[PDB]
Design an enzyme around this catalytic site. Structure first.
Site, short mmCIF file in Angstrom:
data_model
loop_
_atom_site.label_atom_id
_atom_site.label_comp_id
_atom_site.label_asym_id
_atom_site.label_seq_id
_atom_site.Cartn_x
_atom_site.Cartn_y
_atom_site.Cartn_z
N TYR A 53 -38.93 20.07 2.33
CA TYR A 53 -37.47 20.11 2.21
C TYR A 53 -36.79 20.09 3.58
CZ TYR A 53 -37.89 20.47 -2.76
OH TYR A 53 -38.18 20.19 -4.07
N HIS A 108 -28.79 20.52 -10.33
CA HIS A 108 -30.11 20.75 -9.74
C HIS A 108 -30.04 21.27 -8.30
CE1 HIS A 108 -31.75 17.47 -12.65
NE2 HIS A 108 -31.56 18.63 -13.26
N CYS A 135 -32.70 36.47 4.36
CA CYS A 135 -31.38 36.68 3.78
C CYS A 135 -30.61 37.81 4.45
CB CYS A 135 -31.50 36.97 2.29
SG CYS A 135 -32.03 38.66 1.96
N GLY A 175 -26.87 5.86 -12.99
CA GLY A 175 -28.06 5.96 -12.16
C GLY A 175 -29.01 7.05 -12.63
N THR A 176 -29.03 7.36 -13.93
CA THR A 176 -29.99 8.36 -14.44
C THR A 176 -31.19 7.66 -15.11
OG1 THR A 176 -29.16 8.63 -16.69
CG2 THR A 176 -28.11 9.96 -14.97
N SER A 177 -32.34 8.31 -15.09
CA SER A 177 -33.55 7.68 -15.60
C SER A 177 -33.76 7.85 -17.11
CB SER A 177 -34.77 8.23 -14.86
OG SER A 177 -35.07 9.54 -15.31
N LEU A 202 -29.15 0.69 -13.05
CA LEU A 202 -29.83 -0.49 -12.58
C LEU A 202 -30.69 -1.02 -13.75
CD1 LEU A 202 -30.41 -2.38 -10.17
CD2 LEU A 202 -32.09 -0.71 -9.39
N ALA A 219 -25.89 -0.23 -8.44
CA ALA A 219 -24.84 0.77 -8.60
C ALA A 219 -23.59 0.39 -7.80
CB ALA A 219 -25.33 2.13 -8.16
ZN LIG Z 1 -31.21 38.61 -0.21
#
Ligand SMILES: [Zn+2]
Lengths: 235, 7
Positions: A53, A108, A135, A175-177, A202, A219
């Site tokens: 990520y 998401h 945090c 654009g969703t599958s 698409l 798109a």
């Molecule tokens: Zn925390």
């Protein structure tokens, strides 16, 4: 004066050059979704998952990455409809925001946010996540995780989404599958409540009468022309 | 609607 709800997926951001979160063959391009897109994966190898990520977060902010015409057209649609418009995205990029959309529901989550793994509180975050980043919302500072919803976790904003779905006059999926639930089920929920349903993609996701209206193609071409047509049908 | 899931 119709109420319009738009759901977007990875297809709308494909032309922007975004390394994708479209699941194919259990892969997210070259990584196993099981390894970097599940709570177990993060438990098994957090240093790898944080690195995956971290890399995505960097690539998202490279100068070559720009909202495309499809993103801009949705910003125009929100401009015209105000509170009658809601944009829900499965995408964790910020291209809708950069286009000018506001109140985007990221069902998401978001790449540019991290989350306290115990508190669940999210916060803006643009740089890498290291083991010493912890945090500030808790009694004993806890590790931070990407604020991205993994397969097996509950999506965000679902109460708000389903309420809006029950109210929508027009539902548009872009654009969703058609493979990722519950998002792929929204069209069914929209049709149960009498909305006009539109697919802009698409390729076809579903087969049948569940999208009442469908247009296929890149798109950046199909989306601005549906929106521009819709915007001229208001005047 | 349940959890985020494929298929
Ligand atoms: Zn925390």
């Amino acid at each position: 004066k119709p109420r319009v709800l738009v759901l977007t997926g990875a297809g709308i951001s494909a032309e922007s050059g975004i390394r994708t979160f479209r699941a194919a063959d259990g892969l997210w391009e070259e990584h196993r979704v099981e390894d970097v897109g599940t709570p177990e994966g993060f438990d098994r190898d957090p240093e790898l998952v944080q690195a995956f990520y971290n890399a995505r977060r960097r690539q998202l902010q490279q100068p070559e990455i720009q909202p495309n015409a499809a993103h801009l057209a949705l910003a125009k649609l929100q401009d015209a409809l105000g509170d009658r418009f809601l944009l829900v995205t499965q995408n964790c990029d910020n291209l809708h925001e950069r286009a000018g959309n506001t109140n985007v529901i990221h069902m998401h989550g978001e790449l540019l946010k991290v989350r306290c793994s115990q508190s669940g509180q999210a916060l803006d975050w643009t740089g890498d996540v290291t083991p010493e980043d912890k945090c500030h919302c808790c009694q004993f500072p806890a590790p931070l995780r990407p604020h991205v919803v993994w397969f097996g976790e509950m999506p965000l904003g679902m109460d708000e989404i389903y309420m809006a779905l029950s109210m929508a006059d027009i539902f548009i999926a872009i654009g969703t599958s058609g493979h990722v639930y519950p998002a792929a089920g929204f069209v069914h929920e929209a049709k149960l409540h009498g909305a006009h349903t539109v697919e802009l993609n698409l390729e076809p996701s579903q087969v049948g009468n569940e999208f009442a209206e469908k247009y296929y193609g890149p798109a950046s071409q199909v989306v601005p022309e549906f929106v521009e047509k819709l915007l001229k049908g208001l005047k | 609607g349940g959890a985020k899931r494929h298929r």
